[PDB]
Amino acid sequence: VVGGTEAQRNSWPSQISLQYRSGSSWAHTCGGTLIRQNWVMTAAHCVDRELTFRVVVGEHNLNQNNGTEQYVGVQKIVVHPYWNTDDVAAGYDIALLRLAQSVTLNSYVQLGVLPRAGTILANNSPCYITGWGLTRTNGQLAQTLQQAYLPTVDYAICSSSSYWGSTVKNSMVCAGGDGVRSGCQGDSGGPLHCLVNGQYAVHGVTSFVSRLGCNVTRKPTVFTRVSAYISWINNVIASN
Ligand code: NA
């Protein structure tokens, strides 16, 4: 997250770190949201690679023991059937991971609350992106979980020529684009939390930013719109 601030350690208890085995150690690769005790929602493009993955819940600092982490292997990966790795702009950038064990809930580990199906945020709605991604374009991952305030940019605007044009679809949410704050590599698959009727819900799964850099004016960060996939998510979980 570029232009972010350190999160309080109990602010976003549904945030997870998806990590992959790198030699004798593990490395953060993207984010995700805990949606059942044994299911995680992330971006399809995060699990394109044939790696060994684990999920870490209750994580705050990637490089220090927090005393709150639970580490659980990934048992099954279900990517959206329409996903196409070389066409991120076509959408369907979403995947569900079934965990090897069910995690225990506490003040650091809670299920993410999903929006009702079909819900679309009005222009300029207050949202936070969270994650451990790069803190500057071509920079390095954050140590501690970061959060940035990113107001939504509605489809009519985001799909105009000076923003994203045709690349953005109705199945996506855009947020930010002020040129100071944004998502960045390592944030993919992580949540966009939006305050609706007094309750934060996860409205987006971070999907892409501009190749021209993370925080670019009028290239808001693009998220998969979770409310477009409520039935898909239910169907996968019900059949696994
Ligand atoms: Na830690």
Swiss-Prot record:
Residue pairs linked by disulfide bridges in the UniProt entry: C30-C46, C127-C194, C158-C174, C184-C214
Annotated Ca(2+) binding sites: E59, N61, Q64, E69
Catalytic activity annotation: Hydrolysis of proteins, including elastin. Preferential cleavage: Ala-|-Xaa
GO cellular component: extracellular space
Tissues where the protein occurs: Pancreas. Basal layers of the epidermis, hair follicle and sebaceous gland epithelia (at protein level).
Active site, renumbered: H45, D93, S188
Protein name stated in the entry: Chymotrypsin-like elastase family member 1
Organism (species): Sus scrofa
Gene name of this polypeptide: CELA1
